[PDB]
Amino acid sequence: LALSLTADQMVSALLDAEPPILYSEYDPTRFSEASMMGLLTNLADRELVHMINWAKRVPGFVDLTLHDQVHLLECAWLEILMIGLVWRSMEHPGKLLFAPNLLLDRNQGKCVEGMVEIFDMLLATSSRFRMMNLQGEEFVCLKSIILLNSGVYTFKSLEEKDHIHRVLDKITDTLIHLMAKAGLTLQQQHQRLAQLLLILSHIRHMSNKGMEHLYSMKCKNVVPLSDLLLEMLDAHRL
Protein backbone atom coordinates (compact mmCIF):
# COMPACT_ATOMS: atom_id res chain seq x y z
CA LEU A 1 0.00 0.00 0.00
CA ALA A 2 1.77 3.11 1.29
CA LEU A 3 5.19 1.59 0.66
CA SER A 4 4.24 1.08 -3.00
CA LEU A 5 3.37 4.74 -3.62
CA THR A 6 5.53 7.03 -5.72
CA ALA A 7 6.63 10.47 -4.54
CA ASP A 8 3.98 12.08 -6.74
CA GLN A 9 1.35 9.60 -5.57
CA MET A 10 2.17 10.38 -1.92
CA VAL A 11 1.83 14.13 -2.57
CA SER A 12 -1.52 13.57 -4.30
CA ALA A 13 -2.85 11.38 -1.50
CA LEU A 14 -1.80 13.93 1.13
CA LEU A 15 -3.24 16.87 -0.82
CA ASP A 16 -6.52 15.01 -1.32
CA ALA A 17 -6.76 14.11 2.37
CA GLU A 18 -6.49 17.75 3.50
CA PRO A 19 -9.25 18.86 5.89
CA PRO A 20 -11.36 21.97 5.17
CA ILE A 21 -10.75 25.39 6.68
CA LEU A 22 -13.53 25.93 9.21
CA TYR A 23 -15.24 29.18 10.22
CA SER A 24 -15.67 30.53 13.72
CA GLU A 25 -19.08 31.30 15.20
CA TYR A 26 -17.49 34.63 16.13
CA ASP A 27 -19.78 37.67 16.07
CA PRO A 28 -17.44 40.50 14.95
CA THR A 29 -19.74 43.25 16.27
CA ARG A 30 -19.19 42.33 19.92
CA PHE A 31 -13.96 40.19 23.17
CA SER A 32 -13.55 39.03 26.76
CA GLU A 33 -11.22 36.36 28.12
CA ALA A 34 -14.05 33.84 28.41
CA SER A 35 -15.31 35.03 25.04
CA MET A 36 -12.04 34.51 23.15
CA MET A 37 -11.21 31.22 24.89
CA GLY A 38 -14.62 29.73 24.14
CA LEU A 39 -14.12 30.54 20.47
CA LEU A 40 -10.69 28.90 20.36
CA THR A 41 -11.75 25.71 22.15
CA ASN A 42 -14.91 25.49 20.06
CA LEU A 43 -12.76 25.78 16.96
CA ALA A 44 -10.18 23.30 18.27
CA ASP A 45 -12.86 20.70 19.04
CA ARG A 46 -14.29 20.93 15.52
CA GLU A 47 -10.88 20.87 13.84
CA LEU A 48 -10.10 17.75 15.88
CA VAL A 49 -13.05 15.82 14.46
CA HIS A 50 -11.81 16.57 10.92
CA MET A 51 -8.22 15.74 11.91
CA ILE A 52 -9.24 12.23 12.92
CA ASN A 53 -10.78 11.62 9.50
CA TRP A 54 -7.70 13.12 7.86
CA ALA A 55 -5.33 10.86 9.80
CA LYS A 56 -7.18 7.85 8.42
CA ARG A 57 -6.30 9.02 4.90
CA VAL A 58 -2.60 9.42 5.63
CA PRO A 59 -0.95 6.50 3.81
CA GLY A 60 0.13 3.81 6.27
CA PHE A 61 -1.91 5.01 9.24
CA VAL A 62 -4.83 2.56 8.98
CA ASP A 63 -2.29 -0.28 8.80
CA LEU A 64 -1.69 0.28 12.52
CA THR A 65 -3.75 -1.21 15.33
CA LEU A 66 -6.53 0.90 16.80
CA HIS A 67 -4.38 1.22 19.93
CA ASP A 68 -1.42 2.64 18.02
CA GLN A 69 -3.61 5.03 16.03
CA VAL A 70 -5.06 6.38 19.27
CA HIS A 71 -1.59 6.79 20.78
CA LEU A 72 -0.20 8.72 17.81
CA LEU A 73 -3.19 11.06 17.63
CA GLU A 74 -3.24 11.58 21.39
CA CYS A 75 0.44 12.61 21.35
CA ALA A 76 0.44 14.76 18.20
CA TRP A 77 -3.01 16.39 18.15
CA LEU A 78 -2.02 19.90 19.30
CA GLU A 79 1.15 19.91 17.17
CA ILE A 80 -1.03 19.17 14.16
CA LEU A 81 -3.55 21.88 15.04
CA MET A 82 -0.73 24.38 15.54
CA ILE A 83 1.22 23.73 12.34
CA GLY A 84 -2.08 24.04 10.47
CA LEU A 85 -2.68 27.38 12.16
CA VAL A 86 0.85 28.57 11.37
CA TRP A 87 0.40 27.54 7.73
CA ARG A 88 -2.90 29.44 7.42
CA SER A 89 -1.34 32.54 8.97
CA MET A 90 1.73 32.49 6.73
CA GLU A 91 0.49 35.25 4.42
CA HIS A 92 -0.68 37.40 7.32
CA PRO A 93 2.45 38.84 8.99
CA GLY A 94 1.77 39.52 12.66
CA LYS A 95 -1.62 37.80 12.63
CA LEU A 96 -2.99 34.35 13.43
CA LEU A 97 -5.72 33.15 11.09
CA PHE A 98 -7.60 30.80 13.40
CA ALA A 99 -10.43 31.07 10.87
CA PRO A 100 -11.17 33.30 7.85
CA ASN A 101 -13.49 35.30 10.12
CA LEU A 102 -11.11 35.01 13.08
CA LEU A 103 -7.85 36.76 12.30
CA LEU A 104 -6.21 37.73 15.58
CA ASP A 105 -3.19 40.01 15.77
CA ARG A 106 -0.46 39.68 18.39
CA ASN A 107 -1.98 42.09 20.95
CA GLN A 108 -5.33 40.29 21.12
CA GLY A 109 -3.54 37.32 22.66
CA LYS A 110 -3.28 39.53 25.74
CA CYS A 111 -7.04 39.15 26.37
CA VAL A 112 -6.29 35.66 27.69
CA GLU A 113 -3.94 35.04 30.61
CA GLY A 114 -0.71 33.47 29.37
CA MET A 115 -1.91 33.39 25.76
CA VAL A 116 0.41 36.07 24.38
CA GLU A 117 3.54 33.96 24.94
CA ILE A 118 1.97 31.21 22.86
CA PHE A 119 0.90 33.70 20.18
CA ASP A 120 4.49 34.97 19.97
CA MET A 121 5.85 31.47 19.31
CA LEU A 122 3.20 30.74 16.69
CA LEU A 123 3.88 34.06 14.96
CA ALA A 124 7.63 33.45 14.93
CA THR A 125 7.03 30.06 13.31
CA SER A 126 4.82 31.64 10.63
CA SER A 127 7.56 34.18 9.92
CA ARG A 128 10.06 31.35 9.63
CA PHE A 129 7.69 29.70 7.13
CA ARG A 130 7.59 32.94 5.12
CA MET A 131 11.35 33.38 5.26
CA MET A 132 11.74 29.85 3.84
CA ASN A 133 8.86 30.25 1.41
CA LEU A 134 7.29 26.99 2.60
CA GLN A 135 5.18 25.32 -0.11
CA GLY A 136 1.80 23.64 0.28
CA GLU A 137 3.23 20.29 -0.79
CA GLU A 138 5.99 20.52 1.83
CA PHE A 139 3.46 21.55 4.46
CA VAL A 140 1.31 18.43 4.06
CA CYS A 141 4.44 16.25 4.22
CA LEU A 142 5.56 17.91 7.46
CA LYS A 143 2.12 17.47 8.98
CA SER A 144 2.08 13.75 8.16
CA ILE A 145 5.59 13.40 9.63
CA ILE A 146 4.36 14.84 12.95
CA LEU A 147 1.46 12.37 13.08
CA LEU A 148 3.72 9.37 12.57
CA ASN A 149 6.80 10.60 14.46
CA SER A 150 5.85 12.35 17.72
CA GLY A 151 4.53 9.28 19.55
CA VAL A 152 6.52 6.62 17.70
CA TYR A 153 9.36 6.26 20.25
CA THR A 154 6.93 5.71 23.12
CA PHE A 155 5.63 2.47 21.60
CA LYS A 156 5.97 -8.28 19.96
CA SER A 157 4.97 -5.34 17.77
CA LEU A 158 8.19 -3.66 16.64
CA GLU A 159 7.31 -4.62 13.08
CA GLU A 160 4.67 -1.92 13.52
CA LYS A 161 7.42 0.40 14.74
CA ASP A 162 9.59 -0.51 11.74
CA HIS A 163 6.64 -0.19 9.36
CA ILE A 164 6.06 3.33 10.67
CA HIS A 165 9.74 4.12 10.10
CA ARG A 166 9.51 2.85 6.52
CA VAL A 167 6.54 5.12 5.90
CA LEU A 168 8.47 8.00 7.46
CA ASP A 169 11.34 7.36 5.03
CA LYS A 170 8.85 7.47 2.15
CA ILE A 171 7.65 10.90 3.27
CA THR A 172 11.29 12.00 3.46
CA ASP A 173 11.78 10.68 -0.07
CA THR A 174 8.71 12.73 -1.03
CA LEU A 175 10.08 15.97 0.45
CA ILE A 176 13.35 15.49 -1.41
CA HIS A 177 11.46 14.76 -4.64
CA LEU A 178 9.61 18.07 -4.34
CA MET A 179 12.88 19.91 -3.76
CA ALA A 180 14.69 18.34 -6.69
CA LYS A 181 11.63 19.09 -8.81
CA ALA A 182 11.89 22.71 -7.70
CA GLY A 183 15.41 22.78 -9.10
CA LEU A 184 17.44 22.77 -5.88
CA THR A 185 20.98 21.38 -5.87
CA LEU A 186 21.85 18.32 -3.80
CA GLN A 187 23.51 20.48 -1.15
CA GLN A 188 20.44 22.73 -1.11
CA GLN A 189 17.99 19.83 -0.78
CA HIS A 190 19.72 18.45 2.31
CA GLN A 191 20.02 21.87 3.91
CA ARG A 192 16.35 22.66 3.30
CA LEU A 193 15.25 19.23 4.55
CA ALA A 194 17.17 19.88 7.78
CA GLN A 195 15.67 23.38 8.12
CA LEU A 196 12.16 21.99 7.72
CA LEU A 197 12.63 19.15 10.21
CA LEU A 198 14.22 21.43 12.84
CA ILE A 199 10.99 23.43 12.76
CA LEU A 200 9.25 20.34 14.13
CA SER A 201 11.31 20.80 17.31
CA HIS A 202 9.85 24.26 17.87
CA ILE A 203 6.36 22.95 17.09
CA ARG A 204 6.76 20.27 19.76
CA HIS A 205 7.82 23.00 22.18
CA MET A 206 4.75 25.09 21.37
CA SER A 207 2.45 22.08 21.76
CA ASN A 208 3.86 21.36 25.21
CA LYS A 209 3.36 24.96 26.33
CA GLY A 210 -0.07 25.06 24.70
CA MET A 211 -1.09 21.89 26.53
CA GLU A 212 -0.16 23.43 29.89
CA HIS A 213 -2.08 26.57 28.96
CA LEU A 214 -5.21 24.66 27.97
CA TYR A 215 -4.91 22.75 31.24
CA SER A 216 -4.70 25.98 33.25
CA MET A 217 -7.88 27.12 31.48
CA LYS A 218 -9.53 23.82 32.39
CA CYS A 219 -8.87 24.35 36.11
CA LYS A 220 -10.12 27.94 35.95
CA ASN A 221 -13.54 26.77 34.74
CA VAL A 222 -13.56 29.93 32.62
CA VAL A 223 -14.23 27.87 29.52
CA PRO A 224 -16.18 24.62 29.22
CA LEU A 225 -14.28 22.07 27.14
CA SER A 226 -15.97 19.38 25.07
CA ASP A 227 -15.72 15.77 26.21
CA LEU A 228 -13.41 14.97 23.29
CA LEU A 229 -11.13 17.89 24.11
CA LEU A 230 -10.89 16.90 27.77
CA GLU A 231 -9.92 13.36 26.76
CA MET A 232 -7.14 14.60 24.47
CA LEU A 233 -5.97 16.94 27.22
CA ASP A 234 -5.99 14.16 29.83
CA ALA A 235 -3.88 11.90 27.62
CA HIS A 236 -0.96 14.21 28.34
CA ARG A 237 -1.49 13.83 32.11
CA LEU A 238 -0.06 17.17 33.27
Partner: peptide, 9 residues
Protein backbone atom coordinates in the same frame (compact mmCIF):
# COMPACT_ATOMS: atom_id res chain seq x y z
CA UNK B 1 -12.80 6.82 24.73
CA UNK B 2 -14.40 9.18 22.21
CA UNK B 3 -11.32 9.00 19.97
CA UNK B 4 -11.49 5.19 19.77
CA UNK B 5 -15.11 5.50 18.64
CA UNK B 6 -14.33 8.18 16.04
CA UNK B 7 -11.51 6.06 14.62
CA UNK B 8 -13.96 3.17 14.15
CA UNK B 9 -16.66 5.30 12.53
Amino acid sequence: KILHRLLQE
